[PDB]
Assembly symmetry: D2
Homo-oligomer: 262 residues x 4
């Protein structure tokens, strides 16, 4: 089939990439970075993220693979020594696929609307002034948030920024999204829930400005200053990312190796 | 149908109970506290919990209802002023039901095995000495936990003890369980994940002793000192609790009213 | 003596200010906003902060007073109804003074050095890239910090930003400074202390860049992007802020009124 | 002078102890475990604690020393390889001393009063029922605490249990005590400060029962069920523990070695 390979650009990753291509030349495998069916990422989770966003418009016809030339990653979870064996069963096809939920982000302005897809998380901070927003869940005013910002994470994103904010780690088979607070201000006057919140499919969490209508919004690795913002809208996406499964590497084992010890 | 009513035992709750029975006498409704089909709890969430455990062996033939004669509760979420209107549509049947996941707890000894069902959570602390256990997830050693204890919470339990330990609040439609740490000790020598963990159905979290084989285990409101413990076993239950639905009272609205302001 | 009065600029605060001046005209009291001996702040703690920084070069010849025309504040802790009684004993002098510690901040560049004085706290975040610094305490490498940023707080500052980051509240009679982490990243690879740290007088906490030499540094309300930064240097200041004491209002009572209930 | 040596009782520690005594026999040094002037602890911090409490009635005539036959400890901070060099300068006297603050704990009953001295911390939990106490600071009602319990820590104790509860680490030269919450319950109905609190000398923090008058009180390693308790009283002690100083081992270096890496 068609396939392509991105690289972290360092010497190690470039050389591994040329090795796999040459190995791929020994099989029925076209190199196409336009309509590929297999996308191999070599480097770290960041390299994987870029691969994800480069092809987010053909998600349902692609199976991703991550190779970590550095430390183990949650997406780049295959060591370089397994490349040549990776090449072989990728080519002989007939592999199993696994899919993770994704986070849909909608921005409405006073123009139009902008939608984004996030594999890790989307965050909202203010443009310099104080960050204050009203939090509406399924059209009910839940809280007025005053603080540094908010973070909505996918299941697999919970080991990234979400983890640093006290969020829970959840198994990526759970179709859900998790919202955490960044340095919330709490007194008798101003009240937030404190706890992280976890939402199922079809629940819509909407942020609405109170004073400042300008917010710095991040979506995975992108960070853009949006102006004249009327609403920010979060929900579990209908789209999934598909991984090529060649081995048992449990998410919890992946969590242990990254945080307890390898 | 058959029905019964438990009360918090205070003057307010007893009198409301006699009122609903007398109201029930105006309908085709037998009072049976042996094989009832409707269980009404009047008081607080604790009163509801006791009602839950009193009839946990007939869960799939019962629809529960909570009335709070005190503050709003997450299970006793109907105000006393709605009792007489509650009586009427309960009697004319034809109401919708809603179900929450439950937590199965298994204890193995060096005799036999003891299983328990929890609506809020189950906790494990030590008998006085230091609490130390190895944590195995789906048969993989995940961490050696050293600290005060651990807490595994159901979805709806996440607003109770789980919340006090930094756990996330999750919507009770998510079939999952959440594990949190109690005062974990972390240094170069001893390492825990810190983050709360959220598990889907069919994942088995097993606690295994390292030195002391005696643990104080709680299951909702029960707390019993188990001796000669070989293993503690947590997983999402196959059994669900069924609620009688008479009105829209969203869980998140219930969360707002309890923690942000009513 | 000489005195001056700043105002939050809102209608309420301006009118209270003219009232106190007219009241002051009934006494031996010159209005001088150049070499005053009494500085009265009317509005909130922010109004007080500005008053503090406007005159930070004559700290040892000034006694400050805060009046809150809005909610109670930790610096503006006198209600508007006590203005006219405030005017009288301020004028008849012979009052007691109280002093709080201050935080000295030094910035070294590759030009020269810039020093700043902070009444609440100073924070360090990165210019957009990832924030990474080595933390040196009294010339010993303590940790490599990777995360959103760091915050060093004075005693009285601990109820502000410090509180939002999990820092402890400490009595302002303790000559100390407290450092807290902002969303620290912790794994097997990267290790921070997590806990907040509290330092006595004469301990020097130094931040040193690893890659990016550009940091957004805040000092109370100022926030400036410093470039080509070689070192950031924190320590308890030799200078103190002096308050005019007219009544017993314990810091802990002030803490209760602001966070538990008034 | 007179001296004595306690041991962790393991083979390693017993043999090191006999070595130092034999080494001590080569000097003007009497072994007296009744009125000693030098107390050497060999094992861990727990061994040191026991040594501390064994002689807490002669604190002002004793200089302590800790040797760790296991991992580095905050009190047992001398490696076994330095024993013979320890023996020599201890004997030739003329060494510097360093002192850490201690925590006084008073318990009043409906008989009399019981006082205790703590080197690490004192904790208060309930006898099985729910733990609820009113918190009075310098005779002002500060909060009604509902939760698992409270912990008051000395400066040097802040690296122990205090650290596990989110408390700050503070330099032991600061004469202060720190109070932290154990799983506090917070809602609209029940309100705690959340933040850890740090108190200077002469501030009196008093716990008073609301319903249950029975509390499990810990003081370092002791844990005793006190009944008919009218009040628990915390404050910085007038007594200090004195250490023999033979080398520069900064507390912060000690913190780094224990938590970041050795
Ligand atoms: N270099 C720090 C970021 C690495 N990273 C990315 Br990018 N995504 C994740 C993710 N999901 N879990 C954990 N770590 C992640
Ligand atoms: N009186 C304190 C316990 C009340 N309580 C019970 Br009992 N269960 C819950 C629950 N699920 N969420 C919140 N609160 C709960
Ligand atoms: N409007 C939010 C900031 C108010 N504020 C200032 Br400004 N300083 C403090 C301070 N020290 N403690 C508490 N609050 C403070
Ligand atoms: N085996 C766990 C207890 C060890 N330990 C003791 Br005992 N005291 C302290 C202390 N002050 N800081 C750190 N650790 C301490």
């Amino acid at each position: 089939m068609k396939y392509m390979i991105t690289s972290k650009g360092d010497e190690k990753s470039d050389l591994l990439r040329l090795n796999m291509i040459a190995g791929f030349g020994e099989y029925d495998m076209e190199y196409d970075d336009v309509e590929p069916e297999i996308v191999i990422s070599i480097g770290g989770d960041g390299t994987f993220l870029s691969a994800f966003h480069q092809y987010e418009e053909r998600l349902d016809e692609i199976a991703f693979i991550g190779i970590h030339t550095g430390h183990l990653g949650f997406y780049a979870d295959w060591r370089p020594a397994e490349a040549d064996k990776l090449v072989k069963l990728l080519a002989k096809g007939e592999y199993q696929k696994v899919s993770y939920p994704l986070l849909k982000t909608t921005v409405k302005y006073g123009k139009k609307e902008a939608t984004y897809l996030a594999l890790n998380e989307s965050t909202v901070k203010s443009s310099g002034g104080p960050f204050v927003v009203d939090v509406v869940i399924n059209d009910i005013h839940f809280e007025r948030f005053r603080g540094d910002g908010l973070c909505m994470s996918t299941p697999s994103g919970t080991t990234a920024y979400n983890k640093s904010l006290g969020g829970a780690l959840m198994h990526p088979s759970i179709e859900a999204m998790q919202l955490t607070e960044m340095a919330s201000i709490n007194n008798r006057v101003y009240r937030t829930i404190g706890s992280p919140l976890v939402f199922p499919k079809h629940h819509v969490v909407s942020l609405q400005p109170v004073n400042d209508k300008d917010f710095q919004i991040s979506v995975d690795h992108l960070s853009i200053l949006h102006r004249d913002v009327q609403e920010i809208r979060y929900e579990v996406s209908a789209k999934k990312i598909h991984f090529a499964r060649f081995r048992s590497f449990p998410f919890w084992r992946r969590v242990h190796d990254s945080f307890i010890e390898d």
